Amino acid sequence: SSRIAGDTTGKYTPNIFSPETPMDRSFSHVPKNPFWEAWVFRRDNIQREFVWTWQTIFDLATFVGGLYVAMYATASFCSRQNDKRNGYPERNYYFSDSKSNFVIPDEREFY
Amino acid sequence: TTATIEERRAFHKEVLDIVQSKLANKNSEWARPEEPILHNLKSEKEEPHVYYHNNNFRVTRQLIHFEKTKIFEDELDKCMRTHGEAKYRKCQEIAKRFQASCRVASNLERGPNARKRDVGFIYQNNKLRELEKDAKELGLNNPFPPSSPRTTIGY
Amino acid sequence: AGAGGPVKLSPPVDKPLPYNYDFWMDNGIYPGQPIYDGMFGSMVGNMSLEYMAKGWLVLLPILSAPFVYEHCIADDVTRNPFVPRQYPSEVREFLALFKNGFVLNDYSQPDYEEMKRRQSGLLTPIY
Amino acid sequence: MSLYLFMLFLQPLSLSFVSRSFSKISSLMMSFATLWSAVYMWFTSNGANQTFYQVVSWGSDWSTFGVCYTSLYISLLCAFIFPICVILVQGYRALSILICIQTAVSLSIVSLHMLAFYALFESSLLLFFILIGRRKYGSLSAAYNISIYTFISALGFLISAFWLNWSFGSVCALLPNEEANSFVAFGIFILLWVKAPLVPFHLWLPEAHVYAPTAGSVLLAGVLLKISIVGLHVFFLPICASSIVKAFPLILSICLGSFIFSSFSTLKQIDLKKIVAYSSISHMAIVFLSSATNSGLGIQGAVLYCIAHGLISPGLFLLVGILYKNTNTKLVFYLRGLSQQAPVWWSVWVFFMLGNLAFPLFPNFIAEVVCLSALFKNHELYAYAFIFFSFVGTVYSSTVLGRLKGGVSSQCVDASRLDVISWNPLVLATVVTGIGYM
Amino acid sequence: MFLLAVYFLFFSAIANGFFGRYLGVRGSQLLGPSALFLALLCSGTIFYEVCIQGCSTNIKLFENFVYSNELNVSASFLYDPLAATMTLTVVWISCAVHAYQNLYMRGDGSQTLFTSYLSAFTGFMLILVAGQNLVMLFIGWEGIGVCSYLLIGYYGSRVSAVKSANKSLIVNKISDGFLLGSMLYLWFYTGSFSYCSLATFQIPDVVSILVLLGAIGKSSQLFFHVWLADAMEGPTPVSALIHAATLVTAGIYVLCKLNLHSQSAVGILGAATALMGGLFGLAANDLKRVIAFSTCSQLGYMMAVLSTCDDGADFAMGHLVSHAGFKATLFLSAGLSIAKENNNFLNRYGSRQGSPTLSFATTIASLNLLGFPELGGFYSKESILNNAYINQGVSIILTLATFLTAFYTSKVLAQLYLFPYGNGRQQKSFDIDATTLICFGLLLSEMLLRIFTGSSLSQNMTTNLPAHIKNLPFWVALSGALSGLATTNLFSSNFMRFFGNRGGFDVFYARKCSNVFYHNAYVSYTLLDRGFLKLY
Amino acid sequence: TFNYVIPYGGSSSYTINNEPVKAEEVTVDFSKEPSASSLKLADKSDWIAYT
Ligand SMILES: CCCCCCCCCCCCCCCCCC(=O)OC[C@H](COP(=O)([O-])OCC(O)COP(=O)([O-])OC[C@@H](COC(=O)CCCCCCCCCCCCCCCCC)OC(=O)CCCCCCCCCCCCCCCCC)OC(=O)CCCCCCCCCCCCCCCCC
């Protein structure tokens, strides 16, 4: 009912007309499951069940926006500390409103 | 300090002369300069020849600094391994020198956003000394520790 | 016999799968398990999180009572009936440098205040 | 340099004249010749020339090509990884598309003109639309995603290049120019934001990788993501440093958020290819942040980590492709008992997964150490944030390995002689870089 | 000569795990023990040269392992007194475990791979101990972490073993992350990674906390002890190596090598871990679990002693080396009992005719754990308890832990030998070869030598304590042992249940931390990338 | 810089200034200035008028 497709000697031929099934690469394929396949389809196509609800908005804002805000605040604090540590004047950052034009320290200058 | 356009074009012509003199004789170490091209430009980018030459000088210097730091570390490690338990007293100087080399190498070209590398806690100790002096003279109470004699093996 | 023991095979899935089925770990042997035991399903010993919290509430005070006395109620002078080990001046000065040292609690010393401030050092590097 | 460029132009040329039956053999020989020419370029690159090792111009600013530290590493990586892609692909159409994509990418890395850079990198736009959208195994959605994201980002980059060419009068990197404009910086930045996947512009990558052939996925992860770092080092930091320093809190927020959200998203993945794709997105964040610090430690660390990723991600994508060929499945749930059934595939898979987790004997460890040191040079909190969240990568990798490692399986699905041959160079390169020959 | 030991272990790993098809099961039963014997000879030479004769040596293999700008580290090995002592103990225990595995793992399909993993595990432990810089220690730390992941999960078709390995890996990742942060702090402000230049008299609290958090992972302290109990899924030889030396000791070794710890934290954390581990071990009914909780308790004692005095580091290392022998013996004997009885539960053990050597080795190891006077465990434990008197809080908790330790240890000894037979009337047998007898001879030799040679220089130095205070540890141990023999009830069913659930640390993690982790992942993916930002 | 040792870009002195130089000798502007109507409509002073 089965036969060896591969030939090491190099005289490999596909017996497409053989009654016996060739032991080709397809022999080792794993049998799929109707329910697992539908689970895979549902998981990938999860945008269909998306709904804008107050709980969804709350969860999104609290975790994604909340993390982004925390990260920005920490980065701003670290920049302020570094500027104080280095002795540089308050740098003109993008959203910071500073009446100073300092951005890149001069390599020649001694701070 | 202001730079007039006449002076800027004069420096540009001098830079071109320097390039022409360099071009006259072949040099395999052209991009490893031993001396910078001195200038008073507001921005080094204005004179491209000065910018590239000085950048190559800075790279050469930094490579030298890194190798010097490695040498200092080797003498500190040998000194530490020879003395034994007397290492703290006898290896204070070598350690001081090694830490100074580390600061010079890191601080020279730290970058626009990088902080100064406080090898040996010298800056922190200095800050604490100033804070103590101010608190004591003004009669304030300092919430910070007083400056330390030694904070590290050397500095 | 360690090798070759019989095992029961987990039945093949035969109903629509829940969306969060990735929380279940099944290798094909019959007793599958949650990703983290105790996240759902049977709890070991039939003890809920509330029971564990009530236990910890009963236990915590008794465990913390020895530590709170010496650390907070007691003071350097009264903690022990002796002073810290006495060292020659050259040795003592070097030993006092260590923040995690044991010579910083010598009240008898005239440098006690400085040593105490050294022990309660900086939370983070200033530079 | 001239030899490398000539071999690059000969590889697409050779296909036109081959017998149509010798195509695969000729393509493999050409790929090896291009690798050897890259080695020659490395030999003819003296460290004494600190700025640019070699610059060649063929009559115009557009035809100015040159190699620097970043360019040299990326070009060697592309030449090293291309033979593997070639052997994995069958058919004249597939070979033609792959060879054209490779030629365009390899010419982009060495280009020193922004407009020429754009011309060469974006030439391989339809070819990716056609490759990712192939008849049976491709997805039109993924092709549309990647194509539209690339077009919009590259068009913004093009507008910035046009302004720089109008204002300064030249757009060649070799001419020192500085700009403080924020619109132009944003235009150049948006390309980097999209190409190197950074949240929220990372959606194109996973779709493309999943529905691309193994040769395509290997090329994409191996070198296509790196093209961002060449643009940053060569076309962004020299001119728009002021804007990177001005926006550093925002850059850090976006990079760390990308690292965190990508790590969390990797946890919900059930497809091996999607897991590898999201791991790449997480890994790109450290490289981007490290380069943005504009420090020696950061630029070197970013390039080194890029090489480590360009050696570890192709390996995982290759093993995943081999497994899919053996089993026709990428679902972790269907794949069980792989330890017992494929001891040789499993050993290499475990080794590569250990590499992806930045263990000490792997290039990722050294690279990560350098990148973390650069972040610590900026701020201690910056380093701490990245170091702490690295555990999430461990959780997903451990869960995947555990699901694959054991269970009951009735199929012997192990690698053939061809599959071991394809990964052996990658294994040896990983080991060599791991021991410190970076 | 110093390199040879690491070479022998890595060779045995490569040979068994890459060339096992040629060597065979018997070939691994030869090459493993032979290599470990040669490594023992080298470790003994190293110990004599460095510890006894005060000759530290540095071997730099190669320079510029990492060379990016200023950052430069080299692969170098410094054999200092701590390194020599740990090398010797590790190699002695590994040689014994390799001898043990010849008979224990005969019934396991991959005996070649097991031996390979054991030898690579020992090699990475020797790399961690002997490293001269922080990067080499990290290389060892990660190598032992990976080898533990590959050894705990050896039985892949058991979901418990794979989960136990994932647990170990995740906990160790969190710890090594804190360590990496501390190493970055130390490199930045001291200029080097070498321990000689690493010395800092005053360190900011952050570095101390990061160091402690890194150490509490491998040395399973409170909040980080969840993985140790679970690590029982692995084969018995793995448990002996991890618990006795390779894993638990690394945290203590790190704390002792770089004295950046804070007295207040280490004392409280240690005493808490000692008490909790003893209480958890009281409830436990699996033989292998009780010995794990005992390991946790002893680790608590070692961590606690660092706070008491300056010699605490020496006392901790002395306890660590004394503990590795007896604890290894306890695990190997437990494994043999399980193998002979086909049972893991204390209820079903009982008196049965056996080998004199195994029963004696179990009794002597239990006595060392208990604190029987004039034994290696006794001196190393009294050195801790006597010196902890100054810290009133630490001392009281440690004495209570001594009581609980004695109670469970005596209960286990009574249940395994004195108690009548509890297993079924079925044919069970495990015959012991001469290799197992050699293994127990080695463990007993270590135990005997420890008494003659000692564990710390300051072991017998006088602690100026009243006689009643100096001899109290003995009375508490005796009282606990007597109460344990009587198998009396000490706590109500509510507390016995609480202690059986190990304090509910894992129930907290599953109900709250894991749910939060997967809700963050749900928001990050389902709600956002594949929801809001995905086209219809 | 195109090197891995020093930071890319450059630094410009804040103290040193360059005196402005006219783009050309004579400047002819073909761009008309805003009309009075544009300014009137843009005036937001009185909200009702602006609206
Ligand atoms: C002097 C001594 C002699 C020494 C020699 C030196 C001479 C130097 C050069 C001479 C070499 C001959 C030139 C080849 C001409 C024909 C080539 C061709 O038809 O391609 C497919 C053809 C394969 O033919 P086929 O398999 O028999 O079937 C095709 C059928 O006709 C139809 O099949 P189909 O209907 O099924 O179509 C399916 C299609 C799938 O559908 C698509 O994908 C369509 C996509 C649209 C175009 C692709 C956009 C992206 C292309 C990027 C360019 C690739 C290079 C990247 C480098 C960046 C450059 C900026 O897939 C393909 O066709 C192949 C995919 C990839 C090939 C695309 C590249 C060709 C670009 C234009 C070709 C030139 C035609 C000029 C016409 C002249 C008179 C009519 O040739 C190849 O082997 C692969 C392409 C080789 C590219 C080299 C050509 C140069 C183009 C680069 C532009 C640079 C400027 C030009 C300067 C060149 C040097 C001066």
Ligand SMILES: CCCCCCCCCCCCCCCCCC(=O)O[C@@H](COC(=O)CCCCCCCCCCCCCCC)COP(=O)(O)OCC[N+](C)(C)C
């Ligand atoms: C399918 C696989 C089957 C076959 C398995 C192969 C077995 C491989 C054997 C493992 C190799 C272990 C050796 C590790 C050392 C690496 C050797 C090496 O790198 O050569 C060094 C020379 O150094 C040595 O030879 C080391 C001695 C090796 C053996 C000594 C003891 C062996 C015990 C192993 C412990 C090594 C710990 C090192 C941890 C980093 C090159 O000298 P340099 O000129 O200084 O090179 C520059 C440095 N850098 C690489 C960073 C650019």
Ligand SMILES: CCCCCCCCCCCCCCCCCC(=O)O[C@@H](COC(=O)CCCCCCCCCCCCCCC)COP(=O)(O)OCC[N+](C)(C)C
């Ligand atoms: C540092 C200086 C010298 C370095 C030597 C390191 C020691 C040997 C390293 C050899 C290569 C390193 C990684 C080997 C590939 C990783 C795969 C592996 O180790 O094991 C494979 C298979 O193993 C092999 O075939 C190759 C192993 C040969 C030697 C391995 C020694 C232990 C690995 C060392 C850990 C690497 C360190 C990386 C981080 C520091 C999978 O095993 P399991 O998942 O447990 O399943 C096996 C089936 N069963 C369920 C029955 C258990």
Ligand SMILES: CCCCCCCCCCCCCCCCCCCC(=O)O[C@H](COC(=O)CCCCCCCCCCCCCC)COP(=O)(O)OCCN
């Ligand atoms: C609709 C979208 C959004 C809606 C929902 C958003 C809700 C989020 C709101 C709170 C989020 C976290 C709080 C951070 C911002 C707090 C207030 C910002 C103002 C601020 O900068 O204060 C600083 C906050 O402390 C800090 O510097 C940061 C402390 C908190 C960071 C750590 C907390 C979590 C850690 C997790 C890792 C995240 C960071 C990783 C690096 C300290 O004031 P100042 O001294 O700086 O003076 C600076 C002058 N105001």
Ligand SMILES: CCCCCCCCCCCCCCCCCCCC(=O)O[C@H](COC(=O)CCCCCCCCCCCCCC)COP(=O)(O)OCCN
């Ligand atoms: C010696 C050093 C100390 C070692 C460990 C000390 C731990 C002490 C902390 C516990 C003591 C205070 C507990 C808070 C008071 C709660 C009192 C009742 C608890 C309650 O009603 O709800 C519980 C909340 O969980 C909780 O109570 C979780 C709160 C715990 C705070 C986090 C501290 C880490 C805890 C790690 C070990 C503790 C294990 C047991 C807590 C169960 O909630 P539910 O699941 O039934 O809700 C239903 C799901 N919708």
Ligand SMILES: CCCCCCCCCCCCCCCCCCCC(=O)O[C@H](COC(=O)CCCCCCCCCCCCCC)COP(=O)(O)OCCN
């Ligand atoms: C002064 C102006 C004022 C502002 C006015 C703005 C007005 C609109 C501006 C929007 C311009 C963005 C262009 C992209 C449009 C979204 C893509 C079209 C949606 C779509 O259905 O495309 C399908 C697949 O596309 C896909 O699969 C692509 C998925 C979504 C692409 C993501 C867009 C790239 C990133 C967006 C911004 C990135 C940086 C921004 C600087 C193909 O549909 P079909 O072929 O079947 O046709 C059948 C007809 N339904």
Ligand SMILES: CCCCCCCCCCCCCCCCCCCC(=O)O[C@H](COC(=O)CCCCCCCCCCCCCC)COP(=O)(O)OCCN
């Ligand atoms: C809300 C968070 C911001 C999201 C971006 C996060 C990280 C991006 C950083 C990229 C790094 C370099 C880019 C330079 C600036 C881009 C964004 C910086 C933040 C920003 O918007 O600052 C604005 C100025 O920037 C500008 O005026 C230009 C803004 C960008 C233009 C948008 C599209 C341009 C596309 C043009 C294509 C090519 C054009 C070439 C001619 C206003 O800040 P402010 O200084 O006024 O402070 C007043 C507040 N009180």
